[PDB]
Design a protein around this motif. Structure first.
Motif, PDB file in Angstrom:
ATOM      1  N   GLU B  35      45.943  74.069 -37.158  1.00  0.00           N
ATOM      2  CA  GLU B  35      45.694  73.814 -35.753  1.00  0.00           C
ATOM      3  C   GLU B  35      46.652  72.731 -35.257  1.00  0.00           C
TER       4      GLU B  35
ATOM      5  N   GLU C  35      49.809  78.621 -32.353  1.00  0.00           N
ATOM      6  CA  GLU C  35      48.628  79.421 -32.093  1.00  0.00           C
ATOM      7  C   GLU C  35      49.003  80.877 -31.791  1.00  0.00           C
TER       8      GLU C  35
ATOM      9  N   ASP E  34      43.162  83.814 -35.620  1.00  0.00           N
ATOM     10  CA  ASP E  34      43.334  82.761 -36.623  1.00  0.00           C
ATOM     11  C   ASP E  34      42.040  81.963 -36.672  1.00  0.00           C
TER      12      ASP E  34
END
Ligand SMILES: [Ca+2]
Ligand SMILES: [Ca+2]
Lengths: 167, 167, 167, 167, 167, 167
Positions: B35, C35, E34
């Motif tokens: 992340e 992402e 994800d």
């Protein structure tokens, strides 16, 4: 006979030089705080603007397994730990060669925390080598080269690139 | 013209060797968490019992002058900062050569945190040398001897002797 | 056989040179954010003050006809679209030759958004030529001259003169 | 004396040709909307089915430093800014050489947004070269080849490969 | 020292070739989801109609002995396990040589689930060999003949012939 | 004439060897359950503690398009399908060289599920090739190197590294 292993024998590392500048406390530092669990040490060499201090503290860890996922069947009977902290605080200054009036002060701080279970088999050398493995994560190792080499990633991480370049 | 000083020019230090084991991330490590501000990386080489991870994270610092005794002079570029954390987590194992039944796992963890102001004159090398000064506090130095000598602190600190023995 | 037309064959344009400085990502850029729909890329070449980043993102368009006035009878069966965004963020600095203490930082940003229906007949070349038509609106074309010429209107638009000079 | 740098002097680029089709507004375009901050312009040349428009708009930016990681040094002229948008809207048509009944219309749109601070040292040329750097991100460059080579990104990005293939 | 046996030492097999087509994720795939426990990946090279996807997931098994016949006196101290799923989803198209208007899309899906106890002695090679034995059940083996031979069984099972020929 | 395509013509793979150990059912297995939809088979050669079993089952799929993104206008006339499961269950034993009294049993289980539409054009070879592609996802492919190479991914996925290295 009981034997402890760190299980790092199968890991792949590159040695690299990291030469520490160790203080001479007698010459430079005086004691600001002597509480039983927390000591603070000040750098007498600095002018009043510049603050240069170090902080050395220990906390007791109730359950060393509290946030880990080690199965109960494999937990030590003694679940107590020690948490050590070493903080250094420095004050940097910016000035100009040309203008003797231009200047400001920047605050820097950084600390290390070490969470060691209370077990007879853990030794001081084991812990220093742990610290060496830890600080080694500020670099990336390269075994592809014929002489093994390392590259720096502190700036990359600070800029938001937290995944190593090797991945 | 513009010069940043760390104001360590009048501190007294002693060098000592601290050889880092830098990871070959390509062989050993894979990404568990990607992340934006937090990356977790796991060690492929450990068996299923042993857990070996590293965590790399940044946080934005609103006012780097806020908790400090320093405050901002009028010509400072920014109050902004960045806070970096590097954590390593290892799983050590105790076994017995007498009893196949006897064993347990010890969790080790440690991390470093670095709080860098947003000023362009702070360089990657300045920061690494700051880290070297930081880790130096795990030792004590002697100017006296002709080859400078350094003794260790980590044990004495974890044991509660938080003041340097030199003081 | 199905054929797509952009219906620009009857429009009147003037070619003009617009030479792009394309990045060398391997040399300069690292990845800040990965992402699934949004990637961020940072310029490792900059000092800490200067932030230089790029952002590449896609969003899915539910109804590509949602805000258009195309009659239902002429809408594709597949009404899904893709929306692409390309943002660049730069940090410029102002200083003085004479005074090494005079300086400040200016933030620049700009982005491009491209809204492409999901249709097999739209090709990568069609879209690049669309981008060329798009960026051509930062200029005004002049076919009156014997060699066809163009003039710049970015400043004029920024100053509030949004109608072309040709009208 | 006073100099603005875009701090791109240490970035590595590769040039590529991007020939713009600039409109002859006098022949093709007429004004649909002339409000002070938003102008809409329609393409006279299209038939009644096809809709071809361009939109030019500015918005005043209250604090150009507000969303950024940059913040304002003490000697900045203003926090003010201006935000420019240039949008093109086209109507593409799919038909069949087999069936006169078969056809549909695809709506295409795209726009550019530019966020310019209010500093007099920002020049019209600085801004155009910024736009050129911007559009360069639709490509990837290679320093390696003797004639520098550039490959395209628009397809791979619209397909979800948002990281440059060079990285 | 501790040793694990799969107890397949005395069981009788016949080898057969099963050449895997391994994806080049960098060229063909992008990440759709994800999540920490479930990643979804998609083929960006497929045309729009054909969705080619894959899903990689892990659930954690509370008691790996829950649905087994192993009495507690014979269980490990640790009941922990993990459960892996690998799913692939393809879309095949049927069309005609003579007729451009004739066609449809067939959905294919398949997945593998693997339920591994967390024991340090289970190795990645042990697990892959287990997978090879698993997939061997899509065949039937004959070692009586001079060259060991195997016949395929997938269609037979699909068509209700679930008991092997040998039995 | 009618043709089926798997649309894998343009996708990029790397072959790798995966040699299956196929059972000789006549020597090693017996039938535990003979149901029309579910057959269970057991290894009669294993010692009593070690249960080695396999399960072969078929469910019939009512709408093969139920959880797919395929619009009805693109579906076959027949929504029928079949769903195959192949499960293997093994029991591994851990013991010690030094200690005859030390041991336990670990349960392994794994299964494959295949969801085949009933279309005459789907062949047994098509299905086996699909299975080969499925199992290829337990690997990662590299075709850039001079010999095409593959690295294993099973343990990485088990340990939470679910996204491929390439992505
Ligand atoms: Ca994410
Ligand atoms: Ca008006």
């Amino acid at each position: 006979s009981k034997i402890l292993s760190t299980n790092n024998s199968n890991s792949n590392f590159v040695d690299t030089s990291f030469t520490l500048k160790v203080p001479v406390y007698s010459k430079d530092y005086r004691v600001t705080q002597d509480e039983p669990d927390e000591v603070v040490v000040a750098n007498r060499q600095q002018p009043f603007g510049v603050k240069n201090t170090a902080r050395y503290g220990i906390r007791q860890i109730a359950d060393v397994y509290r946030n880990t996922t080690i199965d109960r069947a494999y937990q030590s009977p003694s679940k107590k730990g020690t948490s050590l902290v070493v903080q250094v605080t420095e004050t940097w200054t910016v000035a100009s060669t040309d203008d003797e009036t231009y200047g400001y002060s920047l605050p820097f701080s950084a600390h290390v925390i070490v969470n060691v279970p209370q077990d007879a088999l853990i030794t001081e050398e084991i812990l220093y080598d742990a610290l060496k493995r830890l600080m080694g994560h500020f670099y990336e190792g390269n075994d592809t080269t014929s002489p093994t080499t390392t590259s720096v990633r502190l700036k990359d991480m600070l800029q938001g690139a937290l995944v190593p370049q090797s991945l």
